[PDB]
Design a protein around this nucleic acid. Sequence first.
RNA 1: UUUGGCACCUCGAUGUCGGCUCAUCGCAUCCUGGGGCUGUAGUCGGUCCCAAGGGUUGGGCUGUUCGCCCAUUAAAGCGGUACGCGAGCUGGGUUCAGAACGUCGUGAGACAGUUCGGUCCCUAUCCGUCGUGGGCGUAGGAAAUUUGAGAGGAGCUGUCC
RNA 2: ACGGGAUAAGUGCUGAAAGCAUCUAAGCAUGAAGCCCCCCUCAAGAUGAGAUUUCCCAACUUCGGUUAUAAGAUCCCUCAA
Lengths: 122, 215, 114, 175
Amino acid sequence: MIQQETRLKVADNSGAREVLTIKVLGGSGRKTANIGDVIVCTVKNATPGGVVKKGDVVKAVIVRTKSGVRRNDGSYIKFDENACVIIRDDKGPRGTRIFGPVARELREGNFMKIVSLAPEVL
Amino acid sequence: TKGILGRKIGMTQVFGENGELIPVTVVEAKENVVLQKKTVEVDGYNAIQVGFEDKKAYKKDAKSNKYANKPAEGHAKKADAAPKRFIREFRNVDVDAYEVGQEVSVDTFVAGDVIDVTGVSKGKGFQGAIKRHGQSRGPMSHGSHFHRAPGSVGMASDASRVFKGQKMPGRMGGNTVTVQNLEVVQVDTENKVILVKGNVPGPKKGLVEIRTSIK
Amino acid sequence: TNHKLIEAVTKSQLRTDLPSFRPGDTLRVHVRIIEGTRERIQVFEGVVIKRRGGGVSETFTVRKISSGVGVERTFPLHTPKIEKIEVKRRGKVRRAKLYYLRSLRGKAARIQEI
Amino acid sequence: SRVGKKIIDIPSDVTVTFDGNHVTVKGPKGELSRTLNERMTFKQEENTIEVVRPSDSKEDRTNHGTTRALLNNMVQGVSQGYVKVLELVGVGYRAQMQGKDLILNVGYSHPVEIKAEENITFSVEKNTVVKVEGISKEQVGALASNIRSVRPPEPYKGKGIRYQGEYVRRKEGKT
RNA sequence: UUUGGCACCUCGAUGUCGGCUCAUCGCAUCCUGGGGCUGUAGUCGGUCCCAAGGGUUGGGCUGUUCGCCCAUUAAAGCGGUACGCGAGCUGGGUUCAGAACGUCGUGAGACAGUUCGGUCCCUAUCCGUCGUGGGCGUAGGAAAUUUGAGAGGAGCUGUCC
RNA sequence: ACGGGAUAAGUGCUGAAAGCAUCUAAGCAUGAAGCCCCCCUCAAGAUGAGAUUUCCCAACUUCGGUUAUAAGAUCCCUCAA
C-alpha cells in the first residue's frame, strides 16, 4: 500500500538520499500507486554534494515496492523495502550508478535506458 | 441463441495458452431437456420452455420434494421425459431449430464465445447501509457519536417528509444479475461441464442460466 | 462425480515431471523469460518459504538477497513457464512457512544443511 | 417575399399528368410523381398551364408559387436535366479520385473514403468539370448546393468543392 | 441569492455559526459535447448558440465567515432547500458564571481591545422511507411457467497504438 | 458502449405575400453524456386482477349438504446455498 505522506528511498547517485511524496499523479482523484508509475516528491535528506539538494521539489519513478506485484504469468514478485528514482522529464535519470535490484515491468515503462543502467533485473 | 442451464460448483485457475493464468468457474450443465415449445399465437410469444435436472418420480406420502406430483408428471409426459426439478424459458433463441424431447448438450457451445450469464446473488441478511451501499462512515474518535449509522434522511421541514429512493438499511439478499460479455474456455462432454472465465453470481450448487451474448 | 469432478478435468492441465521436497531448502529454477525478442531462459536461485494446498493451487515461494536486498518470488507449481528445477540443497526446518526470515540478513539469515 | 413576376409555369413535351393530389412528370423523360398542393388546382389546356390562384390567400398564393416554380423545376430537370457544373480541389492530404468514388489520405487513424450518387449524372469531363444532372431544385438543387458544403474551399489555402462561379478567400492567419 | 426599511406569526420558548455524514432541485455551465463565429488558417484567445445528462481533487495556513498558498486534474462552477439537515454527530466558536491585560469610568462597573478556561435531554404514537410478512380476491379448483401496464437503474472520462 | 430515429444548436439548398431570394411557416438531412427507443431489474392487489400447459371432479347428490373427499395443502419433524 503506497500513499502520499509516505517516506520513499532512492537508489541513485543524483544527490538525494531520502524523499517523501506529495502526489500520485494520473487521474482526477487518483490516490495510490505501485511499481511502474511517476510521482512528485520532496527531499527530507540530501546527499552532501550531488545535484539535487535538500528541500527541493522533484519527480521520480517507482521501483521494487514491498507491495510487489503479480503478472499475467500468474506469479508473484515481492521485496522487503521500496525505493524510487529521480528523472528529468525525459525518462532520463540524474544519478547514474543505480544500486540494488529492479523489476522487468518497466521496459513497458520505457526506462529500458535505466534497465541497461541497472544491475540485475527481474 | 443457444441458452443453457446448470449449477455452479467451484472456482479454479488454469494455465491456458502463453502459460497464462486464468481464474475460472466450473459449470455442470446436464440432462438439459426441452419440456415445451411455446409459440407466438398459441402462448403469445414465440419461445421455448426448458428443464434442467431430472428427479425422483411420482410416489406417495411425498413429505418432501425430491418427487413430483400429478400435473408435474402430466407435463413431463407430454414429451417423453422424467421429473425435472428446475424449469425456465427462453425467448432469445430460435426454436424451429429445436425439437421437443431433445436433451441439448454442453457441446452446443464452444470455447471462445461471448455469454451473458444469469444467476442470483447469494444473499447475506439484514445489513447496515455502508455495507448495503457504498457509504463511507464517520469518525470513531475526537469525541464522536456517529460511527456507522447514516445522518441525514432528506431535506428540511420544507418537504416535511422523507423521499423514496433512500438507501436505508435492509435485507441483503440473493437477487437477479445479468453478467455480460464473458468467455468460454473448454467444453467438456464426458462429465459435460463448461469452464468459464472468472466468477458468477450465486453460491455453490446453485444455479445458472447462460446464453450466447451479443454485445 | 459430484466431488472428484474438478480434478477429473484439471489433471489434464496439470504437470507431472516436477520433483518433490519440503521447504527449508536451497533451490535453483530455470525459467522461460519470454521477452519481446525470444524465450530466453534464466535461473533464479533461492530459499523456499512456503507452499500450500493441492492442484493448480499448489503454489510455492522462495527468497533471495540481490544486493543486500531481500527479494521474493512466488510461483505456480504447475505452470508451463518453468524450464526446470534443481534441489541445490536442503535444510532442517521446523515450520511449514518461514516468515521470520523476511527481516534478517547474513549470518542472521543463516541456514542449516538438510 | 417578392417572387411573383413569373407565374406562368407552361408545360413541355414532358406531360404533367395527375395522380390525385399527386402530379406526374411523364412523356419523353418522366414518370416522377409528386404532390403539387391541395387547393392549388393545376390545369393544362393543350400545352400551356399556370397555377390557378384560388382566393390568393397567404397560404394559397404561397402555394401557387410553390407549385409553379416546382413544376418549373420538374419540366426543367426531368425533361432537360437539372444540370449543375462544379469543380474540386483537395491538397496535401491525398484527396484522390476513384472514378465513381474517391479516397482521402486525410491520414487520420484511417484515411477516409467518399462515393458518388444515384439517379443523378455525375458526368466528369476532366475530373474537375463535374456536371450534376437531376430533376429539381428542392432535392437536387439541394444536392448541387450541398456538394459545395461537403468539403468547401477552406480559405487560407483554398482546397474544397467549388462551383464554376465560386472563389477562394483568405483569413487573418494569426494563431 | 447584499446592506437595509415595515413589525404579521411566533417570547405559557419555532433553541445554536461552522464543520461531519447524507443529500436533493436548478442553470444564469466549470469539464466534457456540439455547432457557428473573431483582430479564429486548427489550436488560439475570444465569441454566440445549443446545451444540465453527468461530474466537479488533496493538503498547508485563519472558530473566524474568509481568503492565500503547495501539488494535481478535463475541470477543480455558480446557486436553492429554516443563511439544505443537530428529536443524525461534534461545538472550534460565541454566552453563561472565574481570571488577566489595555482603555474609559470618582467608583460600583463598562468596553470589545484581546487572551486562558469553562454541562449539548428524549424507551418513536401518527404520517413518511427502507424492507418484511399476514389477511382476503381475481365465477370451477390446484401446480408450475409466464406476457408486461408500467416503475426504477443505467450512460463519466482520459490515454497509446 | 452504443445503434437508431425524431430533434436541437444549428448547418447546405426552390416558393408568393411585401411581383428577387433564401440552412422550418412544407423539404432535405443533420446532430447533443438532451429526448425516444438501447440495455438491466421489479412488476396481473395491473380490485382490470392478464396468458399457456398440466392435474383434479361429489358417491350421495338444489352434487345443495353430508361424511367425505381427490389435484392438492398445511400441522409436525431433520436441516441450510
